[PDB]
Design a protein around this ligand. Structure first.
Ligand SMILES: Nc1ncnc2c1ncn2[C@@H]1O[C@H](COP(=O)(O)OP(=O)(O)OP(=O)(O)O)[C@@H](O)[C@H]1O
Lengths: 349, 349
RNA sequence: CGUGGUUGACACGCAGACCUCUUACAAGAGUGUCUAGGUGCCUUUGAGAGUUACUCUUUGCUCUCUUCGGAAGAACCCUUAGGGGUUCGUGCAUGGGCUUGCAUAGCAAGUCUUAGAAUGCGGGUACCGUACAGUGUUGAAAAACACUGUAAAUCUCUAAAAGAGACCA
């Protein structure tokens, strides 16, 4: 139980009601967490490897993750030209990438639920819930939940943007999710679900485990951008392209706060291999292995670890992580055909 | 063709695109119609007799009508206790009321459709339609459909009060109805549906046939309300209290407009019976039968027709119209049981 | 970017972009490679309903009739082509002399030249060429061939806005 607490809490940087999470992990054998993605565009390393690590941690803790693939949201935002078949193909491509990189799908503790199929199977238990949340929460509160999208004082809203937050908030209760690990973008929807749970008088509020938003590889990009193929490593990139991107990534010397490379290491490399091996010249301390972020940050602040040796090591580790994906997509004919089909689809926005 | 057009146009008071109405009644042999109707407890003379006259005219014009029982909307607005099963029983009771007062169910021209059943049957066609209408119509426009529930523009709405206009706007296309008849308040929703139909380039835009709203009996109130028994008469009322209502109803002599009694005459007894018999005193010209509203109002203006003679004749005509309802209630065991259940249930706004 | 070159490549000096390094963008060094577009044609008919809402004015937005037809042209179909039809594809401001405010002349008011499409802007269409991506053939690489899209993919993707008074301010 305590080990489950540590593993689950390690998933997200912010855990609302840690005492409630403790109670949930003590009483419920398998918590049913919830995280989702819109099957569109490319897939940044943050999304891919962070969700893989989070899901592996949750399954090791014994969590029945219910991934929500938002194909109606992609269609309504007009992704891949608003084609359901193209969006399904992109979703299958992403899921195959994840299966290659390490999602424990074979363990049976991870379920990949499509929004369209699940909704059209049981909407009589879903759309009443969306109407209930829309009725119980007022227009000002719902509009405040949609400011993060960029629609609010900045942009005129299309009622669809009063149905989107309501549907995303009702997804948690439709999936009976006891935990939420959505990104910081939808923490507003998580809080909305919490207050709805207060309204409907439920003693088991959904825990929030918002994943830390990876800053972009370029300086100043606090928000992870998957639409600009210059400030984010994508798991479909080649080895040389990944090396170039990491070499061009921002990395201030002797600065740990706001360091894209250090944060990349902390939440991607260390959680995977339980270590960060760096090979350096004899004048630069030689070969040394860092087993923890504590000694990593201590040495980096002291200046013993320098970017000239740091970035090659990070690039090699990222290539080692991405190699299963590239090998799987080169070897499996179905995966290769999926990659070719996705490359054949031009982005329509 | 022209006879059908005249019969159809005799129903509504404001029919937008009368040219389109004629074109539809020429091209199609059986256009599809609906009426908007929320089942909530007692249902007054405007929703009974005016609605059944309109439906009878439309089915005589060889056009089908789909009765749209808005039980889902009632539940999500909480109206009538917010209980699905007994709201359905109320809807069945009112359907029986319309059957008793007169409705051609033998020919299958009328369709008693419950919103919940139809949505549960065809969610995958209806809810994508709702979201598409939401995408096409902006938040301010959806706000502007506000007075259908009886509120001012400056007030604050709930997100369900934005969900609902889109659900109404999508009910038309979900029913695939060609001519639209509802209250005068839902004109904005009907205009929204028309705009959505020219944003999706569907030919044959739905034709709006707006009804006329009967005002309150007491002068100063122009609205209708089943929760307020001081403004309208019901068909679940007894003869004596109906007479009391008619005599307490405001009716100034030699006044053309603003007379609830005259409007009730024109919209209820003249269309139903093609005539009206008034039992006048022997000093006014004896008993006289009026064949048209024009001559009736002319004789009322000329001063030989007084409220003291109009009210007894109005009461007698209304009672004669309502006799089938009471006879059906006393004869049909199922109808009597439904009425007893309705009386046992409590009505809350 | 221009010089010689019909231009693109090719040498020249430089502008920018691409690649290697102290990887921190910056800053600097390195040696190199690369940039494109051009041609011809056309493009402002008036009306009405809906849309801000509490209305009037100036207009926009879809909008269905209507048209010196949404034209320059594409896709498709009919076929003996000379041709016809459907879908699609439609622009925004101003003149110059006539009279006045002004000595005939900035700009405005009464008509005209629909618009000299005249002045500029932007649009889309067809051809060529360039490069990218894919298809099949000759193919050892390379390249060539014929075909299909892109080049500016990019925001009311969502339509009401302003002024004037109601009408509580
Ligand atoms: N760095 C991250 N770590 C973990 N989860 C993340 C991260 N960034 C986003 N997510 C998750 O991804 C989902 C939102 O995805 P995001 O907004 O990045 O784009 P998308 O909708 O998937 O892509 P597209 O822009 O192509 O539509 C949420 O479920 C959020 O929790």
């Amino acid at each position: 139980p305590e080990e489950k607490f540590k593993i689950v809490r390690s998933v997200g940087e912010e855990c609302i009601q840690e005492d409630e999470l403790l109670n949930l992990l003590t009483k419920k054998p398998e918590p049913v967490c919830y995280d989702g993605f819109e099957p569109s565009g490319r897939m940044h390393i943050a999304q891919g490897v962070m969700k893989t690590i989070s899901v592996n941690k949750l399954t090791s803790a014994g969590c029945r993750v219910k991934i929500w693939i938002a194909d109606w949201f992609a269609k309504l935002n007009n992704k891949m030209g608003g084609d359901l078949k193209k969006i399904e193909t992109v979703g299958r491509y992403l899921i195959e990438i994840w299966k290659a990189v390490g999602m424990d799908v074979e363990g049976g503790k991870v379920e990949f639920l499509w929004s369209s199929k699940e909704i059209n199977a049981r909407a009589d238990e879903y759309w009443p819930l969306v109407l209930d949340i829309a009725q119980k929460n007022n227009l000002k509160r719902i509009i405040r939940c949609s400011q993060i999208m960029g629609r609010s004082e900045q942009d005129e809203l299309t009622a669809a943007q009063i149905f989107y937050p309501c549907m995303q908030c009702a997804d948690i209760f439709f999936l009976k999710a006891d935990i939420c690990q959505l990104g910081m973008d939808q923490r507003k929807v998580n809080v909305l679900a919490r207050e709805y749970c207060d309204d409907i008088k439920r003693k088991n509020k959904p825990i929030i485990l918002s994943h830390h938003m990876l800053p972009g590889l370029q300086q100043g990009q606090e928000k992870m951008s998957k639409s600009d193929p210059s400030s984010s490593v994508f798991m479909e990139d080649e080895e040389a392209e990944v090396n170039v991107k990491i070499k061009k990534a921002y990395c201030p010397p002797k600065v740990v706060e706001g360091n894209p490379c250090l944060e990349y290491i902390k939440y991607l490399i260390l959680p995977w291999f339980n270590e960060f091996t760096v090979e350096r010249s004899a004048d630069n301390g030689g070969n040394k292995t860092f087993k923890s972020y504590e000694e990593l940050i201590a040495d980096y602040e002291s200046g013993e670890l320098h970017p000239a040796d740091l970035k090659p090591a990070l690039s090699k580790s990222l290539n080692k992580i991405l190699e299963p994906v590239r090998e799987h997509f080169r070897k499996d004919s179905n995966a290769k055909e999926l990659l070719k089909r996705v490359k054949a689809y031009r982005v329509t926005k």
